[PDB]
Amino acid sequence: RLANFLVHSGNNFGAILSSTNVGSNTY
Amino acid sequence: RLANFLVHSGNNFGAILSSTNVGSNTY
Amino acid sequence: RLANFLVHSGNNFGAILSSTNVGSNTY
Amino acid sequence: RLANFLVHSGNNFGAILSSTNVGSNTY
Amino acid sequence: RLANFLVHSGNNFGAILSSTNVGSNTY
Amino acid sequence: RLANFLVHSGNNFGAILSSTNVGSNTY
Amino acid sequence: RLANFLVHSGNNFGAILSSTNVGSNTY
Amino acid sequence: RLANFLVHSGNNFGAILSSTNVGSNTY
Amino acid sequence: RLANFLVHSGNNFGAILSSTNVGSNTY
Amino acid sequence: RLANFLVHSGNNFGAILSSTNVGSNTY
Amino acid sequence: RLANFLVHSGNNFGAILSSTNVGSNTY
Amino acid sequence: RLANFLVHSGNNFGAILSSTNVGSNTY
Amino acid sequence: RLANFLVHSGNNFGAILSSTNVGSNTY
Amino acid sequence: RLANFLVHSGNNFGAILSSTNVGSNTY
Amino acid sequence: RLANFLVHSGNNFGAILSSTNVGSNTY
Amino acid sequence: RLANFLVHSGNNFGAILSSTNVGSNTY
Amino acid sequence: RLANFLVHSGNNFGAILSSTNVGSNTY
Amino acid sequence: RLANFLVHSGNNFGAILSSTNVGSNTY
Amino acid sequence: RLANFLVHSGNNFGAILSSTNVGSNTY
Amino acid sequence: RLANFLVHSGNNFGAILSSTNVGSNTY
């Protein structure tokens, strides 16, 4: 019985320019 | 019994320019 | 019994310009 | 019985320029 | 019974330029 | 008056998400 | 008056998330 | 008046997250 | 008046996070 | 008046985090 | 003999959000 | 014989959020 | 015979957040 | 015969947050 | 015959936070 | 081949500006 | 081949500006 | 091949500015 | 090959500025 | 090959500035 939790809650990102893999969940 | 949770809740993104894989879930 | 959850709830994206894979679910 | 928690809650990011792997969860 | 907790709560990032692996959880 | 209630009394093996926008300017 | 209540009394094996925006300018 | 209450009385084996934005300018 | 209460009376084997933004300028 | 209360009376084997921003300029 | 020149030539504006008096000429 | 020159040529603005009097000419 | 030159040429602005009087000419 | 030169040429500004009178010409 | 030169050429500004009168010409 | 020429041989008391975009992605 | 020429042989009492973008990604 | 030439042979009492962007990523 | 030439042979009583960006990542 | 030449043979009573960025990461 294996449970994996990847959560993003209430996060604020003002500006994202020329970026990669920002605020993401990767399994 | 395996459960995988990838969640995005209440996240704010002001501006995204020329970016890749922003605020995404990848399995 | 395997359950996979990829969820996007209540997320705000102000502006997306020349970007790829923004706010998406990929399995 | 193994549980893995990767959580991001209430984090503020003012500006992200030419960056990689910012505020992300990687399993 | 093994539990692993990687948490980010209430963290503020003013500006991130040309950086890698900032404010992220890696398992 | 605004009342926002989320109640859970059973056994939950899935995801339960609630998003509400009242009198706001959101985009 | 604003009342935001989240109540949990059962057994939870999943994720329960609540996001609320009241009288705010969000983007 | 603003009242924000999170109550947990059962047995929790998962994640319970609550995010609230009241009268704020967020982006 | 602002009242922010987090109450836990059961047995918790997971993560319980609460984030609140009241009358603030956040980005 | 501002009242911020965190109460724990049960047995906790996990993480309980609370983040609050009242009348502040945060980024 | 009075000559006033207010000129805007070849300027690029990627994204403008919730702003005032951007790239304008005022006499 | 009075000549006043206010010129903006070839300027790039990536992202402008919640700003005032950006890249403008005022006489 | 009075000549006043206020010039902006080839200037790059990556990100401007919550700012005033950026890259402007005021007479 | 009076000549006043205020020039901005080839200047790079990575990120400007909560600032005033940045890279501007004032007469 | 009076000539006044205020010049800014090829200057790089990485990050400017909560600052005043940065990289500006004042006459 | 690309040839961009600006030639001035007379007496100029005004502003002469030239902007060119060749094979570029501009926004 | 790219040739960018600016030639001035007369008497100039004004401003002459030239901006060129060739094969570039600009925003 | 790239050739950028600025030639001035007359009498200049004003401002002559030249800005060029070739094969670059600028923002 | 890249050739950047600035030539001045007359009498200059003003400002002559040249800015060039070749094959660079600038912001 | 890169050749950057600045030549002055006349009488200069003003300012002559040259800025060049070749194959660089600048911000």
Phi, psi of B20 (to 5 degrees): -135, 140
Let me know: does T27 contact D15? Beta carbons within 8 Å: no
Provide the experimental method for this PDB entry: cryo-EM
Which residues are within 8 A (CB) of G15 and not within 5 positions of it... i.e. 6 or more apart?
A5, A7, B5, B7, C5, F15, F16, F17, H14, H15, H16, H17
Q: What is the 3-state secondary structure (H, E, C) of chain L?
A: CEEEEEEEECCEECCEECCEEECCEEC
**Burial track F2-21 (b if 16+ CB lie within 10 A, e otherwise):** eebebebeeebbebebbebb
The CA distance from L10 to Q19, in Å, is 6
Other Cβ atoms less than 10 A from the Cβ of T24: the count is 13
The CA distance from C27 to A5, in Å, is 16
The CA distance from I14 to T4, in Å, is 64
The CA distance from A17 to D15, in Å, is 8
- For residue R9, the distance in angstroms to the closest alpha carbon of chain M comes to 21
Other Cβ atoms less than 10 A from the Cβ of R3: the count is 16
Q: Do N3 and R13 touch (CB under 8 A)?
A: yes
Q: What is the resolution of this structure in A?
A: 3.4
Burial class of residue H12 in the structure, from the number of CB atoms within 10 Å of its CB (0-12 exposed, 13-18 middle, 19+ buried): buried
Residue of O nearest to T25 (CA): O12
Closest CA to L24 of A18, A11, K8, T17: K8
Phi, psi of M5 (to 5 degrees): -120, 120
Burial class of residue L24 in the structure, from the number of CB atoms within 10 Å of its CB (0-12 exposed, 13-18 middle, 19+ buried): buried
Q: Do M17 and A17 touch (CB under 8 A)?
A: no
The CA distance from L26 to M10, in Å, is 20
Which residues are within 8 A (CB) of Q21 and not within 5 positions of it... i.e. 6 or more apart?
K10, L10, P20, P21, P22, P24, P26, R21
Pair of tokens at residue O1:
């015959």
Q: Do E17 and N15 touch (CB under 8 A)?
A: yes
Question: Which chains lie within 8 Å of chain L at 3 or more CB pairs, if any?
Answer: A, B, H, K, M, P, Q, R
Assess K2–B contact: CB distance below 8 Å, yes or no.
no
Question: Which chains lie within 8 Å of chain K at 3 or more CB pairs, if any?
Answer: B, C, G, L, P, Q
Pair of tokens at residue R15:
């401002």
Q: Do G14 and F19 touch (CB under 8 A)?
A: no
> Closest partner residue to L14 among R19, R21, R27, by Cβ?
R27
The CA distance from A16 to R16, in Å, is 36
